[PDB]
């Protein structure tokens, strides 16, 4: 598709003039497959589906100042390693 | 429950009596009690005669049994009276044969029956009556206490001795025709039991016997409209009965008998009502009058004036509690039964509505 890859991008609304805010986003691919016999026996609870999730997250962030006194962090690098808020 | 043998028999007898009286009550509640009042010249005899042709089925099983018992008792009494007269006369006229005397003595001893007369007694009485001496003694002792129908009973003793005898209504009335004071009669209208109480042949003291008649559904009052002079007595009697304390709660029905006689009398032009009732001249025909075609205006005016006076005297007090239902009476038509049935239905409906708070 046309979704941007895992790289830093300017803040759509938090990019103050003279200092664009860097945000981390991407289109990292993910793969899933049915749980095999070994996978099924490795889970205490009954699970009939296994999925692997990979998300583009910022490797590191710096301290930045936003308008109105709100404290925000500016991303410095982007990579696809794992996910934090994927679970719901 | 537990009870003794004598106690059980007594309880069984009491239960049987209770069942019998309940059965009697079932019929009693269905019968409407009505009382008839009228003067000697009021024509009440003609009024009862008209309805007599439509008696209640002629006779009933209980009524038939009662009539048979009464006839047997009357025959026994007549035989006893004849025997007493023969034995107490100047000459001891005995029976033609000793067998007849023995039969008469046995019948006198057997007169203590509970209402049923054996055929042997009837045959003995008939045989004795055939004797010339017995007939002569009876004729010579006609002034004794023997029943007036003794000759009829002796002549009809042959039919009475037969089983399941059915005496005629006239014969039953004659047997019960005495100084009783009550002339009971039965008639059915719309399959409804109706009683009528003809009261008379006694002292004219209504303050002594009207007391018990407070349960009568309605009281029929009949007066002859032909007699102008008798009105004052009729008016006084009506006022007295209307104000009666015991009868101040029962409605009345008025019949104006002798309509044809009144029409004939007023046709002569004498107009004697004016002298008796001076207010008749100032009276006027009500706007609601519906005289029949061909009727003379004077007769209709007099009848309506009489009806208005009767209504006015009745409306003196207690109008709501009980009403008045006057009707033109003529003993030439059978419509009187329908009129009285309609009046009874109306008064029953009014009484029912009184306790339902609709009036």
């Amino acid at each position: 598709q046309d979704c941007p890859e895992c790289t830093l991008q300017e803040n759509p609304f938090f990019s103050q003039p003279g200092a664009p805010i860097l945000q981390c986003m991407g289109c990292c691919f993910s793969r899933a497959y049915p749980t095999p016999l070994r996978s099924k026996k490795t889970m205490l609870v009954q699970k009939n589906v296994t999925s692997e999730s990979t998300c583009c997250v910022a490797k590191s962030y710096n301290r930045v100042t936003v308008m109105g006194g709100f404290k925000v962090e500016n991303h410095t690098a982007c990579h696809c390693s794992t996910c934090y808020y994927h679970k719901s | 429950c537990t009870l003794s043998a004598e106690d059980k028999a007594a309880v069984e007898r009491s239960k049987m009596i209770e069942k019998q009286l309940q059965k009697d009550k079932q019929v009693y509640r269905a019968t409407h009690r009505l009382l008839l009042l009228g003067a000697d010249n009021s024509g009440k005899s003609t009024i009862v005669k008209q309805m007599r042709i439509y008696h209640v089925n002629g006779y009933s099983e209980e009524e038939c049994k009662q009539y048979k018992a009464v006839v047997y008792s009357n025959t026994i009494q007549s035989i006893i009276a004849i025997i007493r007269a023969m034995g107490r006369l100047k000459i001891d006229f005995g029976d033609s044969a000793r067998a007849d005397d023995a039969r008469q003595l046995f019948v006198l001893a057997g007169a203590a029956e509970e209402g049923f007369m054996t055929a042997e007694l009837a045959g003995v009485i008939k045989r004795l009556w055939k004797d010339s001496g017995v007939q002569a003694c009876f004729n010579r002792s006609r002034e004794y206490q023997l029943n007036d129908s003794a000759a009829y009973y002796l002549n009809d003793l042959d039919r009475i001795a037969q089983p399941n005898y059915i005496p005629t209504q006239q014969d039953v009335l004659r047997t019960r025709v005495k100084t009783s004071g009550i002339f009971e009669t039965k008639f059915q209208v719309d399959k409804v039991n109706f009683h009528m109480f003809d009261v008379g042949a006694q002292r004219d003291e209504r303050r002594k016997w009207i007391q018990c008649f407070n349960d009568v559904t309605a009281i029929i009052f009949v007066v002859d409209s032909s007699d102008y002079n008798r009105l004052q007595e009729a008016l006084n009697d009506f006022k007295s009965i209307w104000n009666n304390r015991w009868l101040r709660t029962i409605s009345v029905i008025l019949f104006l008998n002798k309509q044809d006689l009144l029409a004939e009398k007023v046709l002569a032009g004498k107009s004697k009502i004016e002298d008796y009732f001076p207010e008749f001249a100032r009276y006027t025909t009500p706007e609601d009058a519906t005289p029949e075609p061909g009727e003379d205006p004077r007769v209709t005016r007099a009848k309506y004036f009489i009806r208005d006076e009767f209504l006015r005297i009745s409306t003196a007090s207690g109008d709501g509690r009980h009403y008045c239902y006057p009707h033109f009476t003529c003993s030439v038509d059978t419509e009187n039964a329908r009129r009285i049935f309609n009046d009874c239905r109306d008064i029953i409906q009014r009484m029912h509505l009184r306790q339902y708070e609709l009036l």
Partner: protein, 570 residues
């Protein structure tokens, strides 16, 4: 089976002494993890323990001085029935710590982490074997703000001072089936949480304290949450979701990414209350609080007086007397139901929303609805049978043989009583639930059977009224005569009949029309509007029939006078 994992994974050991950027234990046949076996490695950035069925226990101080490590993930613990406390310690750069699918029956200590990260996220799930959360378990875990997501936690209860000396951002406790009960002192020393998720928690009630700082709350599918805290308590509340539609109306009143500092002017709640259950008390008007009480008092007093007069009569019983006694009993039942409804409203005066669920779900509402149906049906049947027997005894007055007796009327009365009982008990069976409307009325018309039943009841009532009117007209025609007619008596009878018919016409016609309109799914008036009719038009019979029937009766007056004389008040 054979595996290509970098660690040796032999001799029942994990082989942690292996250089790898991201440690993994997928399909690793390791059952015992040596204590402090992760030392000597610094190239590892993240540690993942998944797809390890052979794992049974973890040694204490497993991850110590793991400065390089920042995220730890534990999942698929088939036999992890025990975890040594203090496994995680000395993790200044710790960011996320997730433990899922663990059968450990002991809560793993996390206060020794001493993480210095700006935002620390801890996730616990599938903790079926977990008994309860130890007290002060999260105290000192992170100096900065720490977010805890205990989704699907099996803890039975929360110890006092569970979160103290820490700034909690969010507290997710969804799918907490065993967390139905919790102490109110859990947040005695926690500045928050800002957002809470108690969906499917089945919590009996929320803590009194600590809700002031809560901004958002999630209580989806919270059937056990039949009560809510004080409205003024949620001063900072801005948006929340409540399972019960009625509870959402509590926040209606007052005491996206571009929004920024801007916040909604009024709280937002969903789902909105249903139309059949308007956000109001039993009485929607101030004056109804007194009019209803006065009407109920008058009706109950009249019914009691009539019952006392009739039951103490020493005269022979009559069919009209028995019918009047039954009507008085029906009026007494209706008055008792109205009094119970008024008492319930008074008890929950000013807090209708809080107790709406309990009142509408308890046996009280069902009993009130049953009484309301039964009394009305019995009164209607008594009135129509009275009219029918009056017509029969007036039309055939002369035929005394064909007259009703007590023994014959008892059978008809018993049949009518059984029919009314079945009619009232059918909705309790499930034909039409009485919980649809807060006034305990069978308003469940969605089902075709219920709508058909309501239409049949309305048609039966209309037919009974029409039959009564026809009988009265026939009585009037029969009584009237062409010649032997009295103007005064006829006028009095006509006026009595007119008042008798109208006293029920202008009590049944509006209610019947409203019921017919509601049956066809075309509500002409709202529930609040219908409340006025139900409180003003319904009790007309209970307040008019006794006075108009027994009070204005010669026999009743005589009985009352005799009773007064016997009591000494001659």
């Amino acid at each position: 089976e054979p595996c290509n994992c970098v660690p040796d994974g032999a001799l029942r050991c994990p082989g942690p002494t292996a250089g790898l950027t991201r440690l993994s234990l997928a399909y690793l046949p390791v059952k015992v993890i040596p204590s402090q076996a992760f030392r000597g490695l610094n190239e590892v950035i993240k540690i993942e323990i998944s797809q390890i069925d052979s794992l049974e226990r973890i040694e204490a101080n497993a991850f110590d001085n793991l400065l390089n490590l920042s995220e730890i993930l534990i999942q698929n613990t088939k036999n992890l029935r025990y975890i040594e406390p203090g496994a995680f310690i000395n993790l200044p750069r710790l960011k996320y710590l997730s433990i899922c699918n663990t059968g450990i029956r002991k809560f793993p200590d996390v206060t020794k982490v001493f993480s210095s990260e700006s935002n620390f996220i801890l996730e616990i799930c599938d903790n079926l074997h977990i008994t309860t959360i130890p007290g002060n378990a999260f105290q000192g875990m992170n100096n900065e703000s720490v977010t805890l997501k205990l989704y699907g936690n099996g803890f039975e209860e929360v110890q006092s001072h569970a979160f103290n000396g820490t700034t909690l951002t969010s507290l997710e406790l969804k799918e907490n089936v065993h967390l139905e009960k919790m102490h109110n002192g859990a947040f005695r020393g926690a500045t928050g949480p800002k957002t809470l998720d108690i969906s499917s928690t089945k919590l009996q009630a929320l803590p009194s304290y600590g809700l002031e700082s809560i901004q958002r709350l999630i209580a989806t599918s919270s059937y056990s949450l039949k009560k809510l805290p004080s409205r003024e308590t949620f001063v900072n509340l801005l948006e929340a979701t409540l399972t019960y539609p009625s509870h959402c109306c509590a926040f209606r009143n007052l005491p996206d990414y571009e929004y920024g500092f801007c916040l909604p002017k009024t709280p937002r709640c969903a789902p909105e209350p249903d139309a059949f259950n308007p956000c109001e008390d039993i009485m929607g008007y101030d004056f109804l609080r007194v009019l209803i009480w006065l009407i109920n008092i008058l009706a109950i007093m009249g019914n009691m007086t009539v019952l006392f007069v009739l039951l103490t009569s020493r005269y022979k019983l009559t069919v009209p007397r028995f019918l009047m006694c039954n009507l008085s009993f029906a009026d007494f039942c209706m008055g008792l139901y109205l009094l119970l409804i008024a008492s319930v409203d008074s008890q929950t005066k000013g807090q209708y929303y809080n107790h709406a669920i309990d009142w509408q779900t308890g046996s009280g509402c069902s009993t009130a609805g049953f009484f309301t149906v039964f009394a009305s049906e019995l009164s209607v049947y008594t009135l129509t049978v009275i009219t029918l027997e009056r017509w029969h005894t007036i039309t055939y007055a002369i035929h005394l043989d064909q007259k009703l007796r007590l023994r014959h009327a008892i059978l008809i009365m018993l049949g009518g009583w059984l029919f009314s009982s079945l009619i009232a008990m059918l909705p309790l069976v499930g034909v039409s639930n009485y919980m649809k409307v807060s006034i305990c009325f069978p308003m469940d018309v969605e089902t075709t059977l219920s709508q058909v039943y309501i239409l049949t009841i309305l048609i039966l009532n209309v037919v009974a009224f029409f039959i009564i009117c026809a009988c009265y007209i026939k009585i009037y025609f029969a009584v009237r005569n062409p010649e032997l007619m009295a103007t005064n008596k006829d006028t009095k009878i006509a006026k009595k009949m007119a008042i008798l018919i109208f006293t029920d016409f202008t009590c049944m016609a509006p209610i019947s029309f409203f019921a017919i309109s509601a049956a066809f799914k075309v509500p002409l008036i709202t529930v609040t509007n219908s409340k006025v009719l139900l409180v003003l038009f319904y009790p007309i019979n209970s307040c008019a029939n006794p006075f108009l029937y027994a009070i204005f009766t010669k026999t009743f007056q005589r009985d009352f006078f005799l009773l007064l004389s016997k009591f000494g008040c001659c």
